[PDB]
Structure 1
């Protein structure tokens, strides 16, 4: 599987995530037949341009939290976009953004 093939599948997958729903790097990776490529699912998200209609904001980590990144703006934007989607997000002490994963999780 070429990297370009992967990136495209990941993107196709993410677009399938329903409004106001959420999925996981690892889940998407598995979903596209690449269980060990969870980190690369991150990369795919990061690579996207700001205009993209791909719901990159609907992908968090396995702990149901929003991942911290080099570009802190995204971390913030993801929280905001999700909240607009009507997604209850509380803030852990030692400010990490968290949510009830079992509820919002997307299951095809």
Structure 2
């Protein structure tokens, strides 16, 4: 399965997720049948054009945190796009962001 294919398959999927609900890199990685590949899922979400009509924000790590991203300081962007979804978000004095996973976790 050549890249671009995979790239599509993933996208088709993140359009599948419902408002408010969410998934992780781990999970989409296996959903499309390519489990060893979340790494390449962050990868796919990075490759997105910002004014995309895709729930790029509804995908976090398995720890149920927001990931770093660096070259988009406004990784923060991902948060508020989600409070615009009814999801309560906090942190630690580690000052990350976290959430009640098995609640909002997208169970298909």
Give the TM-score taking structure 1 as reference length. Answer: 0.96
Deviations 1:61-103 (A, max 9, x none): 0001001111243420100101111111111212100001000
Could you tell me how far apart the structure 2 residues matched to 1:99 and 1:39 are?
21
2:52 is matched with which residue? 52
| Cα distance in 2, alignment partners of residues 31 and 88 from structure 1 | 26
What is the Cα deviation at residue 44 of structure 1? 0.4
Residue in structure 2 matched with residue 87 of structure 1 by the alignment: 87
CA RMSD of aligned residues (A): 0.9
Give the Cα–Cα distance (whole angstroms) in 2 for the partners of residues 53 and 46 of structure 1: 14
For residues 18-47 of structure 1, the C-alpha deviation after alignment (integer angstroms, 9 at most, x for no partner) is: 001110001000000000011001000000
Quote the Cα distance in structure 2 between the aligned partners of 1:66 and 1:29: 17
Number of the residue aligned with 1:3 = 3
Deviation sequence 1:46-71 (CA, Å, 0-9, x none): 00000111101000000010011112
**Which region of structure 1 is more displaced relative to structure 2, 58-67 or 74-83?**
74-83
Q: Distance in 2 between matches of 1:72 and 1:50?
A: 11
How many residues are aligned here? 108
64 and 6 in structure 1: CA distance in 2 versus 1, 3 angstrom threshold: same
Q: TM-score, normalised by structure 2?
A: 0.96
